[PDB]
Design a protein around this ligand. Sequence first.
Ligand SMILES: CCCCCCCCCCCCCCCCC[C@@H](O)O[C@H](CO[C@H](O)CCCCCCCCCCCCCCC)COP(=O)(O)OCC[N+](C)(C)C
Ligand SMILES: CCCCCCCC/C=C\CCCCCCCC(=O)O[C@H](COC(=O)CCCCCCC/C=C/CCCCCCCC)COP(=O)(O)OCCN
Lengths: 606, 459, 128, 178, 156
Amino acid sequence: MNPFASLTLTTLTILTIPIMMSNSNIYKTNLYPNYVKTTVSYAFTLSLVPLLMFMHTGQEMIISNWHWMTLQTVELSLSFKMDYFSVMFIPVALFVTWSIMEFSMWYMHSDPFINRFFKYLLLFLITMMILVTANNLFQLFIGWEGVGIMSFLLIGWWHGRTDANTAALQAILYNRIGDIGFVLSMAWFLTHSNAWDLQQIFMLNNECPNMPLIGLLLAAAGKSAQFGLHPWLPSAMEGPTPVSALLHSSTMVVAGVFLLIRFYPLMETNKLVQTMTLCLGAITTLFTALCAITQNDIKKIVAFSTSSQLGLMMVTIGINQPHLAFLHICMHAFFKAMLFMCSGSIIHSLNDEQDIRKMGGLYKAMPFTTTALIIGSLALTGMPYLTGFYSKDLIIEAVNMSYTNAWALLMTLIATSLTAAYSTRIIFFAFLGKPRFPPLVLINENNPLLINSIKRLLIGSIFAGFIISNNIPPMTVPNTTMPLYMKMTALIVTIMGFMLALELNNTTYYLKFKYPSQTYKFSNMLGYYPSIMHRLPTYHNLSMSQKSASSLLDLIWLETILPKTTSFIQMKMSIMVSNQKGLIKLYFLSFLITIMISMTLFNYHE
Amino acid sequence: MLKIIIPTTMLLPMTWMSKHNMIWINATVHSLLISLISLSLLNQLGENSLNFSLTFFSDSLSAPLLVLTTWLLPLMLMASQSHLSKETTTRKKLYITMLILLQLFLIMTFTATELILFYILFEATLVPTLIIITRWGNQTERLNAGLYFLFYTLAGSLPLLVALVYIQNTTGSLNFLIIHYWSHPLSNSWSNIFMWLACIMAFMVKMPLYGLHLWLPKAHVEAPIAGSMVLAAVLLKLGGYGMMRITTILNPLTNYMAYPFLMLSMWGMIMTSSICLRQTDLKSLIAYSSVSHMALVIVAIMIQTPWSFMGATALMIAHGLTSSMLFCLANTNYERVHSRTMILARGLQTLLPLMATWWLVASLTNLALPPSINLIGELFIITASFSWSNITIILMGMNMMITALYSLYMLITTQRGKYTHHINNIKPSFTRENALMALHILPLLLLTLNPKMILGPLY
Amino acid sequence: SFPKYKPSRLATLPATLDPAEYDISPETRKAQAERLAIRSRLKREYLLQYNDPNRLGVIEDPALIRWTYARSANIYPNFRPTPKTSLLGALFGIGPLFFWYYVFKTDRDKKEKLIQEGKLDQTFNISY
Amino acid sequence: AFSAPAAYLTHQQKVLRLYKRALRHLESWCVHRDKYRYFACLMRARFDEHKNEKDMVKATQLLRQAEEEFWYGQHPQPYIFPESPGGTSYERYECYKVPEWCLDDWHPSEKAMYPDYFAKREQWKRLRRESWEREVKQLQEETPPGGPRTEALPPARKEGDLPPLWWHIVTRPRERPM
Amino acid sequence: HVTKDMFPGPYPKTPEERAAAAKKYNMRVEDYEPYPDDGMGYGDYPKLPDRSQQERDPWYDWDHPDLRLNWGEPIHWDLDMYIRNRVDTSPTPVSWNTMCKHLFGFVAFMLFMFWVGEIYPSYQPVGPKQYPYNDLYLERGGDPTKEPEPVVHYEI
Ligand SMILES: CCCCCCCCCCCCCCCCC[C@@H](O)O[C@H](CO[C@H](O)CCCCCCCCCCCCCCC)COP(=O)(O)OCC[N+](C)(C)C
Ligand SMILES: CCCCCCCC/C=C\CCCCCCCC(=O)O[C@H](COC(=O)CCCCCCC/C=C/CCCCCCCC)COP(=O)(O)OCCN
């Protein structure tokens, strides 16, 4: 039999073995994190082989191995899709997870529940693999909700902290709002196509209507934190830094984009939904890049960077370039995870300080970290012939050379400049100048785990772009002819972002003080979106939940109409009937009245 | 079917002739054995039901409910013996007798072929529940609760009885097989409208339908733990099962007589989920969550489709297990601290880690995490409702959100944060409590591997 | 001199911008003293039980009992049928029901009369 | 946190707290150290300009416009120490804080490990048990009949007394319990 | 051990009932103010200021530090809404009604400009992309039995 299927299933299966051993003796030892990391490294090495098979012959497969249940005419089976997207994303995710687990072995060394932390990371990885390889909508929903629940558990890792629990519940709330659209798409595809698997859905929908695609767009907006449902990703920085590096930067947050990539045959036939996706991505990327340039927490800046890159992924979906969007996912994973680990090393060295205003000159004090973050910021800004270039350069060219919304294109270019702006902000404030941290200097990056994990993702961020670009078949018609100024536009706007940000950062050395502008206040306070939307709707909903639903209806009026009215009426009737004084005169007078009435009203009618 | 009934009847002299220190052991072992025997009813046919005799029959709808009842008896016995330790021998035997009689009535109710016998057993289940609530409840409100539990039911069921006998005067039979084979349409008349209402409103009250549900928070909050477990897990479903049997004679009237009940169910599902967000009592929150899930079940039964019937069956079983587990979880903390206020005891994950894991799994099944059977039923009902009208998703999705919002809320309030400083009597979890939680949760997860076994006749 | 900050329900007035904290009278000082005395008496009452070595269980808080009772059982005895309560109950309890009934009935009437005309595109719709 | 609050803040205390808040927010605005030192000296001079004002109405109104200026010109994202109430590590280690009474519920097998620790624990429990009644008597003696006025507690005053209500202060879990 | 007369009761009308209610809730009589005597059922319960728990002093030694409550003090009617896992009413650097104007203006401007950009799109000065076999008639769904209208392309 073909080794392809066996290897693809074994790569996923072996990741579950430490979960089975979580009740064994090794889980109570200090060797469990190393065991989990070694298992993930072996899984990555194994998954490298189906990738080679696909790069050789373009091999793709679907495996329907276990029949779950049959609902008259709808068969639900455990089926895995092993197309280009799955076999390309699995090794990238495994590589990033391997680096991040090696990093976590050093970052979380003193945590009393480090074994539980590694188990939780493995559980998230398993759920995300389920999401990526799913062939029907039910399995994909299983992966969707699994990654959501693992995100909830890892954001609220320090469960004695109120802010962590609030952030975890916020993430749940926003992703549930997206789940509404996911469930709408599922119901539509079942009642209209009589299927949940991708094959029949593609066969039966040649002109896909608006409803299922809009549901999918809502689910993607929730999962990838687009402008309507954006605020939960920055607040997810409450979790430990490895959680931010793995889930909320490079792997889980792209899931929504991945969903739109899974259904691109249906989406390319609908232009309204394509325009909606493009506009949502454009406003998202520019708004989040605008918020990033004034933030002072390093994790918050990198999280807003992640949101802006997801917005760019959505705009390249909107111009009908799904393969380019997937390529950007794979490229951005490397350097965004590396940037988060560099931030984590800085934070750990400076006694868990995350504010860039207290980070001084680390260029010489943390040389390897400085080198890695410089290379990562260069990859993020699209420096030529780096990992981000082969992805970002093409996306900008495709938006420039397409029949597209003009406002969306302008917003994308401005966001491209703002990317270099906030990268400059991070580098200038964290690594240049004079120290601004407390005088007891604890700076130490001489740990082999940290160095090796950073080194691995650094080699990735340097060469993966070239390797992956030259080792895949052409899925697109290339833009070979364009005006020269349009060819150089991305570099030009990046240069402007660099120069303008550097000038404004250098003016902070002058002995001049001025009160802030209103535009600065809008940028720093996140467009006031969490100040209004996290207070007004929540207050009104909870207020109506108590005053109207609980008290006015259940405790008052529903009591009043049925049971209290009955009790009152029966009590009054009982009092009226039973209050007879016992005098026979009154009784016998009533008897006479009764006898007369019976003689007149019944006895006269026969 | 007597192979289930007679051992259950034999449970009574066995507990009344047991030694004073052996009642719990004997009752638990033999109820578990009865559950094992009842597990053989799951072999169902497809085409038609298992017709044991003229009196009793088993269907793909009845069998999961019977297995759930027989499985719930040992869990109730396990959960009852802690707070009944100081009780005398005779009153302990009387409590066990009430539980056994309730199981016997429910088992006969779920398998009766004839609608009057079903009605008689359906009412007979009232008496043991009333005695349990009003004799072994803890607070002074229990008496009032009992009254609310009683007259809400009877005010619905007395018209049904009349309708039933009326039907037998015109049809000639109340045997369910005859009723199904000889079914005829209902014309559009006032008499037919009122006969429809008499046939439906008793099961509506039992669900309970939003607006007729005020008895449920009182009765479930004031009841002892076994009372709450049986009231939520099995008794509510008596409504659903009843509806699934009686709608076969109500077509095509249900095509328009169902609009007010559908509106009530959808809006009140939103309303009760929202009520759960502002609740100071931990048991009250669980009761209102039950109301919301049962509203979804009402929608499923009213729209009368195979997918909706399958979803309603699955959701009934899943909710029974989940709500029983949640009530037991709340009762553990209540026996710790002797208060049901949710914010009194906080940060319990620090002090009771394994019980925190149980809380987490129960909360996950409450919000219907895939691939649990809770979500299987919910998704089937939502798909059928979407086919009924595409706008329903707006309400359904909203419900989903609110459900998660209160579930985790409960989890965050009791398990996370910091512990209350002055509460210093929180002892480690007993093996009995952990085993009870496991015996709730493991069958629920195993049902995911074989969902059809709970999907009902329409599968 | 500078733009003035105005408070709202969900963004309240800061203490430092509150004039009441700058216009101080002897009665204000004595009221603050009484508030501190009440707080201190309650604190001593709590701490005498909190540090008691022989105390085991829960220190019952009458304030929590009063709060839960007022939120649950004290509501109906203090309810009075009023035009304000009558209109609010009628609206919030009945208006949504007819609103949703109208919406769903209109949608289903459209769908049904569109099925009758033979123009709905029901192909591949065999599950329901 | 360790000091019992008073009924009100004096003008001097309010002025000092405003000085501290203004300096901290200025440091948030002026990231670099030399610039912050320059502008903090300017703030100190502007603050000393009215140090010797006698009319308390004038001083109070000066404090009012100082507060108004601070509220208009405060940093929207001021620097917060990591373990401060708004910091990124505020209540991070609260889940690792376990009350000492939990040790009484350990299985005897668990207490077989750590024998010396539990011997010292029994010694501490004996001390608390023997001191409780004297602590209560001292609190009753020293409290005016109209109840306590503030939350301040007295020290021990005899030869072998302990300060009343000391157990839960002394047996705090830790700041880094695990 | 809470007796009967320590539970909340009806709305107080006489000054003596107000003094008794203030004493019951451990409040000063000058500070005690009930909810207005409408029919909503508040009864005797005090109407506390509508601040949230996040506004309380975090440097005070609260009996419940996470809730920032003290034992015995009267509890706000809406405590479970203001627990600081939830609705926050803290003062903001920028006024409410000014954040609202800026946010709404930004969103409305973005929506209007996206509509304008839809009206005036961007494109390149090229003609349509051409495909060989009647615009790939058989590839895009086929129907090879109806002789499709010939799409012919010429060199330029
Ligand atoms: C708290 C929750 C409790 C549970 C609530 C249960 C809800 C039950 C409601 C029953 C729904 C419909 C009942 C009957 C169907 C139609 C009713 C009527 O309004 O429709 C019109 C009926 O016409 C008139 O409106 C007559 C009805 C008006 C008189 C009834 C009084 C209604 C006032 C509301 C009373 C509140 C009821 C609930 C009390 C608690 C239709 O006109 P027409 O097609 O020509 O006649 C159809 C009947 N035919 C065919 C036999 C001739
Ligand atoms: C928890 C509270 C629940 C309250 C439930 C109350 C509603 C129950 C439904 C009505 C009960 C009585 C109906 C009688 C049973 C129907 C059998 C039947 O078919 O008889 C009808 C007769 O129908 C009737 O007479 C019923 C009229 C109503 C009599 C009692 C009125 C009580 C109040 C009416 C409205 C309340 C019912 C609905 C309430 C909904 C729940 C709140 C026709 O028989 P014939 O005489 O032979 O005529 C054939 C030629 N047409």
